[PDB]
Design a protein around this nucleic acid. Sequence first.
DNA 1: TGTCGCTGAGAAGCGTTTGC
DNA 2: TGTCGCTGAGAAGCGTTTGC
Lengths: 103, 103
Amino acid sequence: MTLPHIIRPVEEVTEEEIRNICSNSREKIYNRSLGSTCHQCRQKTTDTKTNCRNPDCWGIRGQFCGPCLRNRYGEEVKDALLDPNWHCPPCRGICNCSFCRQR
Amino acid sequence: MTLPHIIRPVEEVTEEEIRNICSNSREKIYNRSLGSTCHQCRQKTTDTKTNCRNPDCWGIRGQFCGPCLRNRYGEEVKDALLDPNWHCPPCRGICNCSFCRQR
DNA sequence: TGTCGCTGAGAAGCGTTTGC
DNA sequence: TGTCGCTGAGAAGCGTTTGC
Ligand SMILES: [Mg+2]
Ligand SMILES: [Zn+2]
Ligand SMILES: [Zn+2]
Ligand SMILES: [Zn+2]
Ligand SMILES: [Zn+2]
Ligand SMILES: [Zn+2]
Ligand SMILES: [Zn+2]
């Protein structure tokens, strides 16, 4: 059931993907088929989300929506998508989601 | 992929299952279809194996073969199968398998 | 510009495997 | 009477969800 984690190279990141980053939480488009889930807000939407570059990372915990990364971690998805060494907050051990800050 | 954990009641344990407990490791029958895996020796065989009674337990880590439970933990599968309150060594946190004693 | 609860999740088994 | 290495594993998303 675990969705495979695939590292998208920074040179392979499209400007269409960059412009499809969500800016306002309430303006999201839910899609049970093509959408992706943000680890923080746990909403499966079509807006572009971050991609963890840690080889040992797995699953969906590296995917964060636009609003979530800039409000819970003070970082921009556009910078994380083009960051060669970006690790998700779970990898950094700084995730403050409902689950992570309890466990 | 996780095999569901089902608690077999002690009153529902068959004498045929009891007599099918493995006694010698080298006299095991491998079966990729009907066999079960022992958490300790990691062999999928048809010999009767233990069943953890912990409700929060999951997966295969509660299944131990005859030789493994009596050689690594000094306990008998026949006693564990009829024990109302038996928890597997992983639940007791005393598992000494190759993986558990490292992590 | 905004978030958590809840279910169900939380591997398993072949291969290179058997104590001195 | 006997055991470990190795791959691949290690959730995800709807519902009861949006900061004052
Ligand atoms: Mg799974
Ligand atoms: Zn989010
Ligand atoms: Zn990560
Ligand atoms: Zn988290
Ligand atoms: Zn065994
Ligand atoms: Zn158990
Ligand atoms: Zn173990």
